[PDB]
Amino acid sequence: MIREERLLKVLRAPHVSEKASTAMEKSNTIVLKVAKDATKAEIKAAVQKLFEVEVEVVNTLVVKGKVKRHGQRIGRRSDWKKAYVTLKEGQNLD
Amino acid sequence: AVVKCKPTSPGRRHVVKVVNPELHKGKPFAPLLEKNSKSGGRNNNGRITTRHIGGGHKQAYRIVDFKRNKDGIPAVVERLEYDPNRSANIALVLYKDGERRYILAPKGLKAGDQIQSGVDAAIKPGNTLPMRNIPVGSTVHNVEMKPGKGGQLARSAGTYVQIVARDGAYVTLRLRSGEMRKVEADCRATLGEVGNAEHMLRVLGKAGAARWRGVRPTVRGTAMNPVDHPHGGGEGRNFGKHPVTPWGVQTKGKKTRSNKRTDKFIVRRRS
Amino acid sequence: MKRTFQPSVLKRNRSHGFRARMATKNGRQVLARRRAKGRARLTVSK
Amino acid sequence: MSGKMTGIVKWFNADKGFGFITPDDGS
RNA sequence: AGGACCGAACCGACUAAUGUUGAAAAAUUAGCGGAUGACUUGUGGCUGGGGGUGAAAGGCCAAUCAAACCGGGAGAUAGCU
RNA sequence: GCUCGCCGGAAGACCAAGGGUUCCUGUCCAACGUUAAUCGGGGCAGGGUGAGUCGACCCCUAAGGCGAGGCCGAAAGGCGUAGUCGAUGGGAAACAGGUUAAUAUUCCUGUACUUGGUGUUACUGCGAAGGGGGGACGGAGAAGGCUAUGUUGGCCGGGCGACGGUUGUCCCGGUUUAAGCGUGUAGGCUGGUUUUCCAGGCAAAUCCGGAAAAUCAAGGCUGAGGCGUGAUGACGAGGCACUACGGUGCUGAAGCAACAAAUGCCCUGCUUCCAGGAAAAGCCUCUAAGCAUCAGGUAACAUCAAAUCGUACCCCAAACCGACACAGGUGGUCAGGUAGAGAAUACCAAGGCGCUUGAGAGAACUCGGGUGAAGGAACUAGGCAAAAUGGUGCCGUAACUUCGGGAGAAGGCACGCUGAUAUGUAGGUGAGGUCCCUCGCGGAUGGAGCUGAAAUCAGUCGAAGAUACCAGCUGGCUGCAACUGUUUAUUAAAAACACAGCACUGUGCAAACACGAAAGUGGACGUAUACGGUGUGACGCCUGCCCGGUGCCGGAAGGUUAAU
Ligand SMILES: [Mg+2]
Ligand SMILES: [Mg+2]
Ligand SMILES: [Mg+2]
Ligand SMILES: [Mg+2]
Ligand SMILES: [Mg+2]
Ligand SMILES: [Mg+2]
Ligand SMILES: [Mg+2]
Ligand SMILES: [Mg+2]
Ligand SMILES: [Mg+2]
Ligand SMILES: [Mg+2]
Ligand SMILES: [Mg+2]
Ligand SMILES: [Mg+2]
Ligand SMILES: [Mg+2]
Ligand SMILES: [Mg+2]
Ligand SMILES: [Mg+2]
Ligand SMILES: [Mg+2]
Ligand SMILES: [Mg+2]
Ligand SMILES: [Mg+2]
Ligand SMILES: [Mg+2]
Ligand SMILES: [Mg+2]
Ligand SMILES: [Mg+2]
Ligand SMILES: [Mg+2]
Ligand SMILES: [Mg+2]
Ligand SMILES: [Mg+2]
Ligand SMILES: [Mg+2]
Ligand SMILES: [Mg+2]
Ligand SMILES: [Mg+2]
Ligand SMILES: [Mg+2]
Ligand SMILES: [Mg+2]
Ligand SMILES: [Mg+2]
Ligand SMILES: [Mg+2]
Ligand SMILES: [Mg+2]
Ligand SMILES: [Mg+2]
Ligand SMILES: [Mg+2]
Ligand SMILES: [Mg+2]
Ligand SMILES: [Mg+2]
Ligand SMILES: [Mg+2]
Ligand SMILES: [Mg+2]
Ligand SMILES: [Mg+2]
Ligand SMILES: [Mg+2]
Ligand SMILES: [Mg+2]
Ligand SMILES: [Mg+2]
Ligand SMILES: [Mg+2]
Ligand SMILES: [Mg+2]
Ligand SMILES: [Mg+2]
Ligand SMILES: [Mg+2]
Ligand SMILES: [Mg+2]
Ligand SMILES: [Mg+2]
Ligand SMILES: [Mg+2]
Ligand SMILES: [Mg+2]
Ligand SMILES: [Mg+2]
Ligand SMILES: [Mg+2]
Ligand SMILES: [Mg+2]
Ligand SMILES: [Mg+2]
Ligand SMILES: [Mg+2]
Ligand SMILES: [Mg+2]
Ligand SMILES: [Mg+2]
Ligand SMILES: [Mg+2]
Ligand SMILES: [Mg+2]
Ligand SMILES: [Mg+2]
Ligand SMILES: [Mg+2]
Ligand SMILES: [Mg+2]
Ligand SMILES: [Mg+2]
Ligand SMILES: [Mg+2]
Ligand SMILES: [Mg+2]
Ligand SMILES: [Mg+2]
Ligand SMILES: [Mg+2]
């Protein structure tokens, strides 16, 4: 059992998108921005405890950060991690 | 059997094959094989120590009994095989207790003969017994220099050594080079000449047949520049100097033996 | 024509990388020179 | 705009493109 | 069968023209040689500078080689401009 | 949007390497883009990469690297044992369909599969850092069996023709379907089985190997493809409807056969040759100490787990290496039609492009080409360059020769189309049908149907029938080098180098020699029929005289002669 403090530090934010709204309405799948070191079991435990909802499976991907230029000085945004969390049928989430 | 090839192409114009139909047309005995990785004539420093070596066909090593320690136990000869590692053919023998080994094939040896090492061995071509038990005047091969070290003399395709004398602990040998050498009388030796005597009767015909054998081409020294070789240079073909190595050592005639440890074992030099 | 730089990250890092510099004595003196000069990229290694 | 590399080492001549337009007549 | 033959891929580079502040710091076009072999190619590895390697042209060793490159002795010396 | 043109063994598609957001959408046009730009791989903002089966990671090792101790070395450090790294190679498993502006073998639907776990039940010799097997391997060649795929017919749907004709021997399109599971085929290999014994495999062994004896000829292993299922499904031309004209929803016919056929598969096969063709683990098995009724073992079932990283995009290129949006370079995979020997070449399909300045004019001159009176190398250093020859089949073919060649010598004839032989032949394929059977993916017979050269004869057209592209100029004398090869990346491809061969000479093994202050290593896990060096350079006839000089070898009586 993963401890609740880590499970509270795993999830960062929900990801709003046209693809996220599509997966939410068709496959009943939410799209989350998670901590970068978070694994699939930590995500499934966090969603099953902090949201009280039944998780079927978790797919993850790492988003590479973009290279931006503030004025003319170059810079690079952070790599962040994205999770497609497929809920079981009948389950609902805000 | 030497076979002159018909000149259907240059490179087949001058080829003489050495065809032996008794050799096994199959894979060798797998437990007695091991890997033989090529070197290119390069040492652990990566530098070329001996030149003109490189390339050639991949070769597996055949573990050959030179020490020949299975005393008393007779062995029948199973089949004759090709060895790429050496000029002589090898014989796969089967001892009575179920052990298989490779030996050097003697001249008249064929599949089905019986051999036996040891002191009580008979005197026929193939047996291995100490030279205090071997009669003076016989031709032996696979000769040890030290007892139990393994045979080191007369291993090439057609060689043999005569036993010309014996004075107690030593026997005197007539090596194939003509040198007369003392060896302890407890060293093992194997009766008869080594097999493939017509190996030297082959002609490679073309350059690729040496590149198959890993012999890179030899650039003669006067075709170079003086920075490369002492012979190099000239505004034409000029060689107004004594023949030397690439390192300036006389080659035509100059002796190079500097072993004062083994001079007591040398009766007469070659000549 | 075939030019002299044909990149390969494995060969780049095995030849000029950090561990290859830290392996030998003279390579460690290279990293000490670049730190004294204040290099941002101390080696090839990303 | 970051427009260097114009006359830096004039590699223009570091090219040192073969001269001696086959004129060894001046010997 | 063949370091066999003709001939694409592929490797090479014999001739001519163009181009020569080029399309290109050696190429294009039309022809050309080898093309189952001493072939060619991918990846990785090894050999280090008076040293390597070299089917040997003083060839090649990062567009640099009758002794690489970088830093240092070093503001070498220069009866020379 | 309609036409035109180009590639099409690529100028199409998929990747690796490499790059690293160039991907998609909205918006902008200052700069960049060799012009303008509303456009963009440009600026700005947002979005986008979903895996138990793909790959990496991981297990395993090669070359090689590092290297506890160790040996060696002024120091630094060098080499290297046990080990440990190191892929480019070995090792478990997923397919089809659908969908997004952008991902999919990753999502969804369907149908599977693998390896580990724990826990049940039955059964009961388990056990390795060790032994054995296997993994496990070359080149070339020959067919045979297939499939991918294509063509034609049938079938279904639609059409009846802008200009003569077109209800037909007419036109267009479609006719797709996987992994898996079952079957074990063409075909390849192999003698099986039982018992006894045994100086071997470091000890052991029931394993392997080897001796015996008896019995049975017929069992086993491997194995493309096919067939069945998967699949009453999915897909599907089209319709039916809404329609932001983009699309979304619903419905949905036929979905067969023959022939040809690979460079792909059986094939890691078979035959054959000499130059004699990785390793280790996984896997199978054997026992050792040990464990003694416990552990563990396999068999079924249930359940759980299969993490992490990559996944966008270009990838013969405007995104990589070339300073450029550079006519260069870059490894793997796929390989449609007609003609054709062909992956050449010509025209096309799928698909992708028209190469980021145009518009005129129609001078000299230059570039790349076309044709040319008469002559035909008179040009020129020189037939440089051009032009010409060019295919298949048959006839025929010299000197010389190492008897192989020369030789495609040279030179010449035929070549289209239509009809007949024969409404399409020989040949190939092979059905129905019938018979037999140890019964099946069977064996005969049988010839339907399909496919289909080549030849002769007759006729006919044109100036011309290898009609285009493609595609040898030939011969004579002679120098050099035997040949194939190699070489001055970037002015020299040659008579230069190499070569097989020959000779001399050194070398007896802790070999000579070479790299190394050394240890060591190569030579070589080789042993004088071997290795090194030197010169010559196939083959044929040959290789003559000189040892005075310079070298080298041998000598050791005398002279001279160092340190001491
Ligand atoms: Mg999933
Ligand atoms: Mg992933
Ligand atoms: Mg040599
Ligand atoms: Mg030679
Ligand atoms: Mg030579
Ligand atoms: Mg020269
Ligand atoms: Mg010299
Ligand atoms: Mg001269
Ligand atoms: Mg002279
Ligand atoms: Mg050839
Ligand atoms: Mg050819
Ligand atoms: Mg060309
Ligand atoms: Mg010179
Ligand atoms: Mg250079
Ligand atoms: Mg130097
Ligand atoms: Mg110097
Ligand atoms: Mg000074
Ligand atoms: Mg100065
Ligand atoms: Mg258009
Ligand atoms: Mg075209
Ligand atoms: Mg950008
Ligand atoms: Mg775009
Ligand atoms: Mg845009
Ligand atoms: Mg404007
Ligand atoms: Mg502009
Ligand atoms: Mg942009
Ligand atoms: Mg190693
Ligand atoms: Mg070491
Ligand atoms: Mg140590
Ligand atoms: Mg390992
Ligand atoms: Mg690999
Ligand atoms: Mg692996
Ligand atoms: Mg895409
Ligand atoms: Mg084994
Ligand atoms: Mg092979
Ligand atoms: Mg078929
Ligand atoms: Mg009409
Ligand atoms: Mg009409
Ligand atoms: Mg049709
Ligand atoms: Mg099936
Ligand atoms: Mg992709
Ligand atoms: Mg492309
Ligand atoms: Mg452009
Ligand atoms: Mg380009
Ligand atoms: Mg074609
Ligand atoms: Mg083509
Ligand atoms: Mg004009
Ligand atoms: Mg013309
Ligand atoms: Mg004329
Ligand atoms: Mg005329
Ligand atoms: Mg004239
Ligand atoms: Mg004249
Ligand atoms: Mg010409
Ligand atoms: Mg022409
Ligand atoms: Mg006819
Ligand atoms: Mg003359
Ligand atoms: Mg020649
Ligand atoms: Mg040639
Ligand atoms: Mg070259
Ligand atoms: Mg040149
Ligand atoms: Mg040239
Ligand atoms: Mg040694
Ligand atoms: Mg010569
Ligand atoms: Mg002479
Ligand atoms: Mg003399
Ligand atoms: Mg002397
Ligand atoms: Mg003296």
Author numbering:
A (entry chain S): 1 to 94
B (entry chain C): 2 to 272
C (entry chain c): 1 to 46
D (entry chain B): 1 to 27
Task: Copy the relevant paper text.
To explore the nature of CspA intermediates inside the exit tunnel, we determined the structure of the ribosome with the 27 aa‐long CspA nascent chain (CspA27) by cryo‐EM. After in‐silico particle sorting, we solved three structures that showed different conformations of the nascent chain and carried the P‐site tRNASer corresponding to the mRNA codon 27. The cryo‐EM densities for the CspA‐27 complexes reveal three different nascent chain conformations inside the tunnel. In conformation 1 (CspA27‐1), the nascent chain is more extended at the N‐terminal part; the region immediately below the constriction site appears more compact. In all three conformations, the CspA nascent chain makes numerous contacts with exit tunnel residues. In all conformations, U2609 and A2062 are in contact distance with the nascent chain. Arg61 of L4 has identical orientation in CspA27‐1 and ‐2, but contacts the nascent chain only in CspA27‐1. Finally, when we extend the PTC comparison to CspA27, most of the PTC nucleotides superimpose between all structures, except A2602, which adopts a rather distinct orientation depending on the nascent chain conformation. However, when examined at lower threshold (contoured at ~1.5σ), nucleotide A2602 cryo‐EM density can be observed distinctly displaced toward the A site in the extended CspA27‐1. This position could potentially alter placement of the incoming aa‐tRNA and suggests a mechanism whereby the nascent polypeptide folding could locally attenuate the elongation rate by modulating aa‐tRNA accommodation.
As a model protein, we have chosen the cold shock protein A (CspA) from Escherichia coli, which is a major regulator of the transcriptional response during cold adaptation in many bacteria. It consists of 70 amino acids (aa) that form five β‐strands connected by loops. Strands 1–3 form an antiparallel β‐sheet that is closed into a barrel by packing strands 4 and 5 to strands 1 and 3, respectively. Here, we combine biophysical methods with cryo‐EM structure determination to show that folding of a β‐barrel protein begins with formation of a dynamic α‐helix inside the ribosome.
